[PDB]
Structures are given as structure tokens and as C-alpha cells.
């Protein structure tokens, strides 16, 4: 059991940092472009609804 | 077992424990040893209790 | 699997909405952020920066509003904004706190996933007044034999564990928390006491040290360690016995007992002065805060004994107070002592003469005292501390030729001295607790020398489970020793002595 939950532990790390590699790739794409105009239109639609 | 998700031992130790459920087999050794005892034992016994008895009213 | 809670992690985080007031920071130096903002902002309200650090804010200036920052300095840099959080200090409650150590704000850090709570409750609400209170009356032993005869320690009352610097003072506490075992396992819910460890100031290992000896004598599933540790940011060391307070309430509200152990507030007050001080609160009485008083006070009243109008819970409380050098004049002990209800007094030169549990009898007092007790126990050693009272005063003509009386007195209490120590991290059950005091009190063991004191202790443990553990059980479960009892009793001792 102590070791099973050790493993659990082991891959939730493990996973983490794989997931700050794919963050790294995310902020490159020109989705950090098209995000905005996403962004634009949400503040718009948010601002709006106040 | 619920707790393990490796589980595949819980089986191999269930069953391991559940069948040398005996670990040790029984010693019923006091029936040769308790009964000699007691013949040595139950002679002197009334031995003093005969003497004495006598003795008192003597 | 852990892949799964992931995906269900990023699938349970949304998108947010318009977050009124910001804030600026102005400067931010010594922990100290002061941001120009937040127009409104509640005092003592928890607001969030742009880093991620949490802080409150303990100032409300004029022009500035003086956020004390709960991480570390370099988080937090000159200008960023200051979100506004929006709810004063305040911890999840709830019975789901049992069996996890978590930190100050609340945040699970034993690391066996969320915290499951039924409240969050604010983390400075008053203390329980005038009419919701009712006398004590209920025993807690503490299953240190010392504690439970000398110095009775009752449900609700708070007492100080006052004592020299590193003379195990936690050791004592800590075995208090063992006993409660015993009654907890069982199914009366008007016995559980759950304690509850608040580890204020120690270094991350040996709040380690003291998981790890909860969980070996199996007693981690009524404890919760709230703990915030040495290393942690002074707001969190400062909020930490507060924090502790409002797990506690959760308890008390709802009608169970519980025990709250603040260890140590000699360092909490060490907390209060590094913020007031940094904050440039005007400064007091042996450089601590000025209303150091009232930040002692406050904590140390929401331990209560509530009425039955109101539930008939409780709260009981031992404060630890750390002596510098066993001066008991020093400012902050002084301030503490006079707050709470009774005092234990450890001393560090009965530690090194071999008496652990170290209570220095004739310093050591309770105010509550006849209150508690177990009606049993109180019987069959109201003599054992007039024994020791002669013992202490006959204790320095041990250097001649000395009257028989005096040499009466002398047998009997060093004997009666020897017998009440006890081994050090194993509590002792109460029904054991009234035999053994009755021989030393009844004065067959008198006879016996005092190397062997020790040897016959545990023998008439061993003897009396053989020999009569009916007697054993009529005197655990009676509770009260009548007169057949104290006879069968007599006879019993009598028969161990011979043997």
C-alpha cells in the first residue's frame, strides 16, 4: 500500500512537468494571437452583462 | 484490498494465509508426564495424610 | 487514474468574472506590502496578489492600506495588482478535519488529498459570555499519574503547561493526547475527547517527528495538527493558534468535548512581535506588542464549558509556556500565567533527578481542582497530597540523628515520590491509576525499598489482572469506591505485598 501511494504520488509529479512542456509550446503559437481577440469579446460580453 | 490498486498479492497473501491457516499443530504432551506425576505424587500424598492422621489420634 | 483527476482538475477550473477593487502596491519591504487601493476592504480581510502570496490586512491606513504578506518577500515586487478576497481570515471546519494536518489557511498539507469540511468559520469570533458558560464538571484524565492525582485536570478549563526551555515539555502534553485513546475507541459519545495539536513555531521535523508518533500508537483519527511551522511566513505563525481556535469551535458548537493543546505560546508571542513591530504599531513593555495582553487573552478565553441551554459541549485548553531560564517574572510567562486557570510547573532539575513526568508538586496548582477528578481516584489520594506536602517540608533534614517521626515521614515519601513517575510517551488507564496510588496511600509499599518500587509497580498491575480483574473492572466502570470496594481492595494489596 505505502508504495502503490508512493507510485500515485510519483506519477502526479511526473505528469506536472509534462504538462509545463506543453504549457512552453502553448505560449509559442499564434493562439497567443487568437486567444486575444477570444479574450476581447469575452470582456466585452462580461462587461456588458454588469 | 479496496485500498491497493496494484492488487494482485492481495489475492496471492489471502489465499497463502487462508490456506496455512493452520501455523502450528496442536501438543497435547500433559497426559503421559501429568498422570506419572500424579501417581508419585498421589501416593506420598496419602502416605503423610494416613500417617499423620494416625499419628494425631495416637 | 491519476490521470483521470487531472482531467477532471483542468475540466474544474472556470473562467471568472469581474473582480472588484485592486490595488497597487506602493512599496513592499520587510513583508510589509503597503498598497495604495482597495477602497473598501474589510479589516483584517484575506486579499490575494498578483504573485499568488495571500496576506491580510492588518492595517487600515489613512491613505494606504498595509497588507502583511504571508509568504515570502520576493513574491510580491513594487507594483502589481492586489486582489481583493473578500472574507475575513477563516479556516474550513468541519468533522472531516479529523486525521489530517493542515496548515494555517487550512490547506490540506499532510497531503491526503482535499479537505473535507462542513463550515468555513471566521478565525476571531468572540468567546463564549456570562450566561452560555456552566461550571466544569466533567474529569479528562490525563493518564499521567502525577497529573490525574496532583493536579486534576477537568473539561473546559484552561491550564497552563508552564516550564523550563527543552525539558520535554511537549512530552507531557503529547501523552495527554495518548490517553484520550481509551475512552475515545468506544462508542459513548459523551466520553470523546478530540484533541486537537496546534504546532506553532517547531521546525518542519519534528512536527514530523511528532506525525509520525500519533500515527504509531495508532492515534491519528481523533487528532487534527494544525501546523504551522518554523519556516512558515510570521502572518501565518501569528494567525496559527487563532486558526487552531476555530477547529476547535466546530467541536464545541456541536456538543462534543474536545481538548485544544496551543504548544507553544511563548512562541506565538514572538509571532505577534515581529508583525506589530515591522507594522511600526507603537512598540511596548520588553519590546513585544502593546495589547500583547489582550492577544494572549482573547485566545485563551474561547476555552469554555458551556451550559446545557447550550448544548453542554467543551472546549478544554493547555496552554505551553516556554520559561526562558525558569523566569517566571519575564513579561510574556507573567501575562499568561495571570490568564489562565492553573498552572503545571516542570521543573528542569526534577527532570535530570529522574522524576519525568517532571511536575514540581509544590508549584504546581489547579484551580478547578475537586471539579474534576474521577470520584474514585479523588478519594483514595486526598492523603497522597497531604503525604507529599510533609514530604517536601521534611525534605532537607535528609543531611542525622532524626526522630522517629521524622524518619516515618521520610520512608513514606520518598517511596510515594518514587512511585509516581512514570515512563515516558505511555499513558496509564485510569482504573489502574486508583490501585496503584491506594498501596502507596494505604503504606504497604512503604515496606518495600526503593530500588524494587519500580519492579513491584508493574507486578501489582500484573498481579491484579490475575488475581481480581473483577476488582479492576468494578472499580473502572463504578467510578466511585464504596466501602466493600476499598475492603476487597485492602485485601487485595495485602496479598501483592506478601507475595
Redesign the interface.
Same mark, same amino acid.
Given at each position: 500500500?505505502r508504495?502503490?501511494a508512493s507510485?500515485? *504520488?510519483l506519477? *502526479?509529479r511526473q505528469?506536472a512537468k509534462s504538462?509545463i512542456s506543453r504549457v512552453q509550446s502553448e505560449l509559442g503559437n499564434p493562439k497567443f494571437q487568437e486567444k486575444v481577440l477570444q479574450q476581447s469579446i469575452?470582456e466585452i460580453e *462580461?462587461?456588458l452583462s454588469? | 484490498r479496496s485500498?491497493?490498486?496494484?492488487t494482485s498479492v492481495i489475492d496471492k497473501i489471502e489465499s497463502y494465509v487462508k490456506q496455512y491457516k493452520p501455523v502450528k499443530i496442536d501438543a497435547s504432551k500433559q497426559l503421559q508426564v501429568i498422570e506419572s506425576f500424579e501417581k508419585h505424587a498421589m501416593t506420598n500424598a496419602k502416605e503423610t495424610e494416613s500417617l499423620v492422621s494416625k499419628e494425631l489420634k495416637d | 487514474?491519476?490521470?483521470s483527476i487531472?482531467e477532471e482538475r483542468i475540466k474544474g477550473v472556470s473562467?471568472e468574472?469581474?473582480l472588484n477593487e485592486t490595488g497597487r502596491v506602493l512599496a513592499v519591504g520587510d513583508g510589509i506590502a503597503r498598497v495604495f487601493g482597495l477602497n473598501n476592504i474589510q479589516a483584517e480581510e484575506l486579499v490575494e496578489f498578483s504573485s499568488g502570496v495571500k496576506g491580510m490586512a492588518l492595517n487600515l491606513e489613512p491613505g494606504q492600506v498595509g497588507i502583511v504578506l504571508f509568504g515570502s518577500d520576493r513574491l510580491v515586487k513594487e507594483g502589481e495588482l492586489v486582489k481583493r478576497t473578500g472574507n475575513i481570515v477563516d479556516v474550513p471546519v468541519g468533522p472531516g478535519l479529523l486525521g489530517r494536518v493542515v496548515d494555517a489557511l487550512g490547506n490540506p498539507i499532510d497531503?491526503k488529498g482535499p479537505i473535507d469540511a462542513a463550515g468555513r468559520s471566521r478565525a476571531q469570533v468572540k468567546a463564549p459570555g456570562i450566561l452560555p458558560r456552566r461550571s466544569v464538571h466533567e474529569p479528562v484524565q490525563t493518564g499521567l499519574k502525577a497529573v490525574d492525582a496532583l493536579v486534576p485536570i477537568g473539561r473546559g478549563q484552561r491550564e497552563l503547561i508552564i516550564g523550563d526551555r527543552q525539558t520535554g515539555k511537549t512530552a507531557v502534553a503529547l501523552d495527554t493526547i495518548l490517553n484520550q485513546k481509551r475512552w475515545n475507541n468506544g462508542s459513548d459519545e459523551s466520553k470523546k475527547l478530540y484533541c486537537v495539536y496546534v504546532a506553532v513555531g517547531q521546525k518542519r521535523s519534528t512536527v514530523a517527528q511528532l506525525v509520525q508518533t500519533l500515527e504509531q500508537h495508532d492515534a491519528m483519527k481523533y487528532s487534527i495538527i494544525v501546523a504551522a511551522t518554523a519556516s512558515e511566513a510570521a502572518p501565518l505563525q501569528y494567525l496559527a493558534p487563532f486558526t487552531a481556535a476555530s477547529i476547535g469551535e466546530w467541536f464545541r458548537d456541536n456538543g462534543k468535548h474536545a481538548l485544544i493543546v496551543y504548544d507553544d505560546l511563548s512562541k506565538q508571542a514572538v509571532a505577534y512581535r515581529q508583525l506589530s513591530l515591522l507594522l511600526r504599531r507603537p512598540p511596548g513593555r520588553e519590546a513585544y506588542p502593546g495589547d500583547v495582553f489582550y492577544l494572549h487573552s482573547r485566545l485563551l478565553e474561547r476555552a469554555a464549558k458551556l451550559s446545557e441551554k447550550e448544548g453542554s459541549g467543551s472546549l478544554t485548553a493547555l496552554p505551553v509556556i516556554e520559561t526562558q531560564g525558569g523566569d517566571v517574572s519575564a513579561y510574556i510567562p507573567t501575562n499568561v500565567i495571570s490568564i489562565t486557570d492553573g498552572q503545571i510547573f516542570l521543573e528542569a532539575e526534577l527532570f535530570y533527578k529522574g522524576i519525568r513526568p517532571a511536575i514540581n508538586v509544590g508549584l504546581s496548582v489547579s484551580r478547578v481542582g475537586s471539579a474534576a477528578q474521577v470520584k474514585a481516584l479523588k478519594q483514595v489520594a486526598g492523603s497522597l497530597k497531604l503525604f507529599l506536602a510533609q514530604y517536601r517540608e521534611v525534605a532537607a533534614f535528609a543531611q542525622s540523628d532524626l526522630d522517629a517521626s521524622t524518619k516515618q515521614t521520610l520512608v513514606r515519601g520518598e517511596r510515594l515520590t518514587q512511585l509516581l513517575k512514570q515512563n515516558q510517551y505511555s499513558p496509564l488507564a485510569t482504573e489502574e491509576q486508583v490501585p496503584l496510588i491506594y498501596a502507596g496511600v494505604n503504606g504497604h509499599l512503604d515496606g518495600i525499598e526503593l530500588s524494587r518500587i519500580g519492579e513491584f509497580e508493574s507486578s501489582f498491575l500484573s498481579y491484579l489482572k490475575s488475581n481480581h480483574n473483577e476488582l479492576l473492572t468494578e472499580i473502572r466502570e463504578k467510578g466511585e469506591l464504596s466501602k466493600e470496594l476499598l475492603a476487597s481492595l485492602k485485601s487485595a494489596t495485602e496479598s501483592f505485598v506478601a507475595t
Amino acid at each position: 500500500v505505502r508504495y502503490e501511494a508512493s507510485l500515485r *504520488q510519483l506519477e *502526479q509529479r511526473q505528469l506536472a512537468k509534462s504538462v509545463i512542456s506543453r504549457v512552453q509550446s502553448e505560449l509559442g503559437n499564434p493562439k497567443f494571437q487568437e486567444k486575444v481577440l477570444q479574450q476581447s469579446i469575452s470582456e466585452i460580453e *462580461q462587461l456588458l452583462s454588469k | 484490498r479496496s485500498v491497493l490498486k496494484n492488487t494482485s498479492v492481495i489475492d496471492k497473501i489471502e489465499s497463502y494465509v487462508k490456506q496455512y491457516k493452520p501455523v502450528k499443530i496442536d501438543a497435547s504432551k500433559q497426559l503421559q508426564v501429568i498422570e506419572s506425576f500424579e501417581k508419585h505424587a498421589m501416593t506420598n500424598a496419602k502416605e503423610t495424610e494416613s500417617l499423620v492422621s494416625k499419628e494425631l489420634k495416637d | 487514474e491519476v490521470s483521470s483527476i487531472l482531467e477532471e482538475r483542468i475540466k474544474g477550473v472556470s473562467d471568472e468574472a469581474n473582480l472588484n477593487e485592486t490595488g497597487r502596491v506602493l512599496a513592499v519591504g520587510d513583508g510589509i506590502a503597503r498598497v495604495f487601493g482597495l477602497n473598501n476592504i474589510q479589516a483584517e480581510e484575506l486579499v490575494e496578489f498578483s504573485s499568488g502570496v495571500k496576506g491580510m490586512a492588518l492595517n487600515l491606513e489613512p491613505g494606504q492600506v498595509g497588507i502583511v504578506l504571508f509568504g515570502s518577500d520576493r513574491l510580491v515586487k513594487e507594483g502589481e495588482l492586489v486582489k481583493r478576497t473578500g472574507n475575513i481570515v477563516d479556516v474550513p471546519v468541519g468533522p472531516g478535519l479529523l486525521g489530517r494536518v493542515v496548515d494555517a489557511l487550512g490547506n490540506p498539507i499532510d497531503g491526503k488529498g482535499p479537505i473535507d469540511a462542513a463550515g468555513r468559520s471566521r478565525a476571531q469570533v468572540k468567546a463564549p459570555g456570562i450566561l452560555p458558560r456552566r461550571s466544569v464538571h466533567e474529569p479528562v484524565q490525563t493518564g499521567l499519574k502525577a497529573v490525574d492525582a496532583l493536579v486534576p485536570i477537568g473539561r473546559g478549563q484552561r491550564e497552563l503547561i508552564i516550564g523550563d526551555r527543552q525539558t520535554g515539555k511537549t512530552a507531557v502534553a503529547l501523552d495527554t493526547i495518548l490517553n484520550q485513546k481509551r475512552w475515545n475507541n468506544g462508542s459513548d459519545e459523551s466520553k470523546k475527547l478530540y484533541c486537537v495539536y496546534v504546532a506553532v513555531g517547531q521546525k518542519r521535523s519534528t512536527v514530523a517527528q511528532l506525525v509520525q508518533t500519533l500515527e504509531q500508537h495508532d492515534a491519528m483519527k481523533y487528532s487534527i495538527i494544525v501546523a504551522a511551522t518554523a519556516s512558515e511566513a510570521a502572518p501565518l505563525q501569528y494567525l496559527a493558534p487563532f486558526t487552531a481556535a476555530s477547529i476547535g469551535e466546530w467541536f464545541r458548537d456541536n456538543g462534543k468535548h474536545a481538548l485544544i493543546v496551543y504548544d507553544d505560546l511563548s512562541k506565538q508571542a514572538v509571532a505577534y512581535r515581529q508583525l506589530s513591530l515591522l507594522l511600526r504599531r507603537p512598540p511596548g513593555r520588553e519590546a513585544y506588542p502593546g495589547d500583547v495582553f489582550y492577544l494572549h487573552s482573547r485566545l485563551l478565553e474561547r476555552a469554555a464549558k458551556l451550559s446545557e441551554k447550550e448544548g453542554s459541549g467543551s472546549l478544554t485548553a493547555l496552554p505551553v509556556i516556554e520559561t526562558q531560564g525558569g523566569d517566571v517574572s519575564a513579561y510574556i510567562p507573567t501575562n499568561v500565567i495571570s490568564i489562565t486557570d492553573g498552572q503545571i510547573f516542570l521543573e528542569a532539575e526534577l527532570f535530570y533527578k529522574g522524576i519525568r513526568p517532571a511536575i514540581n508538586v509544590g508549584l504546581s496548582v489547579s484551580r478547578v481542582g475537586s471539579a474534576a477528578q474521577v470520584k474514585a481516584l479523588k478519594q483514595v489520594a486526598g492523603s497522597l497530597k497531604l503525604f507529599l506536602a510533609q514530604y517536601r517540608e521534611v525534605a532537607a533534614f535528609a543531611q542525622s540523628d532524626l526522630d522517629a517521626s521524622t524518619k516515618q515521614t521520610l520512608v513514606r515519601g520518598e517511596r510515594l515520590t518514587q512511585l509516581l513517575k512514570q515512563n515516558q510517551y505511555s499513558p496509564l488507564a485510569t482504573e489502574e491509576q486508583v490501585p496503584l496510588i491506594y498501596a502507596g496511600v494505604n503504606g504497604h509499599l512503604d515496606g518495600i525499598e526503593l530500588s524494587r518500587i519500580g519492579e513491584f509497580e508493574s507486578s501489582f498491575l500484573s498481579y491484579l489482572k490475575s488475581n481480581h480483574n473483577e476488582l479492576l473492572t468494578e472499580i473502572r466502570e463504578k467510578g466511585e469506591l464504596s466501602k466493600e470496594l476499598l475492603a476487597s481492595l485492602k485485601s487485595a494489596t495485602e496479598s501483592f505485598v506478601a507475595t
